[PDB]
Target: 2-aminobenzoylacetyl-CoA thioesterase
Amino acid sequence: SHMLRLSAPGQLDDDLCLLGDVQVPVFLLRLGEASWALVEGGISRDAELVWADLCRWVADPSQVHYWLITHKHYDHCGLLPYLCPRLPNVQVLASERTCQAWKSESAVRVVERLNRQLLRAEQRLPEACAWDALPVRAVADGEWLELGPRHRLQVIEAHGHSDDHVVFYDVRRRRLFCGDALGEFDEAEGVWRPLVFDDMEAYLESLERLQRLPTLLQLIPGHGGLLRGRLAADGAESAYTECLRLCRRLLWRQSMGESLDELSEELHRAWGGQSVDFLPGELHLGSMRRMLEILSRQAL
Ligand SMILES: CC[C@](C)(CNC(=O)Nc1ccc(C(=O)Nc2nccs2)cc1)N1CCOCC1
Ligand SMILES: [Fe+3]
Ligand SMILES: [Fe+3]
Model:
């Protein structure tokens, strides 16, 4: 593997561990002698794996006090109903629009269906509390999250991947939990693959704003581990560049009379392998289709 990417479970930094699977990770922050936080909310089927990992670092789970959520997609909040009942003192921190999703009977329905397609036939889930009963506290754009004496993270709105997406910036550590706002990091090639599933202008505008942060040392997306060195410092600029590259490519093929379905199958072919173990079959191709439709509307 590559020294600019930390992609193994376990300790990542003095205060930081990766729990569960690197492809859909949950990050553990040590806030103090008896205080911890989680960041990112995973897929439901990983409940017992993430729990087992957690208990290796946290002897008393009533010490997990915060759980930070970047956005409402099924692969970023699927653990909450299954692990929150095991964390009696936790407070889920999420944006207003993310919290709204969990009160929508129809939105919750899709999160559950997508997660249940990932269950192995062997396993059943733990007893879950209701989605509208999660211990949540809505956070707003620009709010400072005073998690502990050495952990202060700023909430930054970063719409475009989804209409609710936020990121969390630890300025003391030049550390950005960026969710899917920069896209999907390509592990074989070292570049970002765009994930524009709501609004292209918002996605680009968010990346512009994130480039203005003080130089990053650690960049932690929703999938694939921790990026450092030049990958963190240039991440938001590079993600912006790769989005434009995809737009140009789409414009090029359309101008040769190609249907969106052509570049869609090509993109699914080139990029679908990374997420095949947590993104159900037709969903990735459908996702590529939806992205190209969004790019095509906001550029033709
Ligand atoms: C809570 C609201 C929600 C249930 C959210 N829906 C999802 O979570 N869908 C979803 C679909 C595709 C990807 C995807 O392609 N991920 C990738 N990761 C890597 C490469 S592509 C991720 C998530 N709504 C939204 C639409 O209305 C009804 C359902
Ligand atoms: Fe997402
Ligand atoms: Fe995701």
About this structure: The pocket of WE1 (ligand 1) is lined by residues 72-75, 101, 107, 110-111, 184, 195, 275, 279, 283-284, 287 (CB under 6 Å). The chain has one domain: 1-300.
